[PDB]
Amino acid sequence: VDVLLGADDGSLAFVPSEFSVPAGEKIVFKNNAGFPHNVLFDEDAVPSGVDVSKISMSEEDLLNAKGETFEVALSDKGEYTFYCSPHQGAGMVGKVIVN
Ligand SMILES: [Cu+]
């Protein structure tokens, strides 16, 4: 499934910001508008057993150009919160439910 980083209208949002996916589907976060963005998972809001370091960009790594992607495939079922490091204080966060 593709998830846009920034809305076409400049909103600091993941698009979509909440979605469900079967375990192991590749999620392609795709840089879209209003950079820089990145993608990290919140160590306090993922299923027990999940190591966020493996499914997160490094905080220092930013996507500054349209069409760059960060791709992950989540195998453990449950809810995961992911966020943009630059924009997480501006509500750029989202929830994927792996079922
Ligand atoms: Cu962002």
From Swiss-Prot:
Co-factor binding details: The crystal structure with reduced Cu(1+) has also been determined.
Subcellular compartments: Plastid, Chloroplast thylakoid membrane
Taxonomy, superkingdom: Eukaryota
MF (Gene Ontology): copper ion binding; electron transporter, transferring electrons from cytochrome b6/f complex of photosystem II activity
Cofactor(s) listed in the protein's UniProt record: Cu(2+)
Topological type in the membrane: Peripheral membrane protein
Plastocyanin-like domain location: 1-99
Positions of Cu cation binding: H37, C84, H87, M92
Chief location of this protein within or outside the cell: plastid
GO CC list: chloroplast thylakoid lumen; chloroplast thylakoid membrane
Keyword check for Membrane: yes
Keyword line: Chloroplast, Copper, Electron transport, Membrane, Metal-binding, Plastid, Thylakoid, Transit peptide, Transport
The UniProt record lists the keyword Transcription: no
Family: Belongs to the plastocyanin family.
Role noted for this protein: Participates in electron transfer between P700 and the cytochrome b6-f complex in photosystem I.
The protein, known as: Plastocyanin B, chloroplastic
Originating species: Populus nigra (Lombardy poplar)
Span covered, complete protein: 70 to 168 of 168
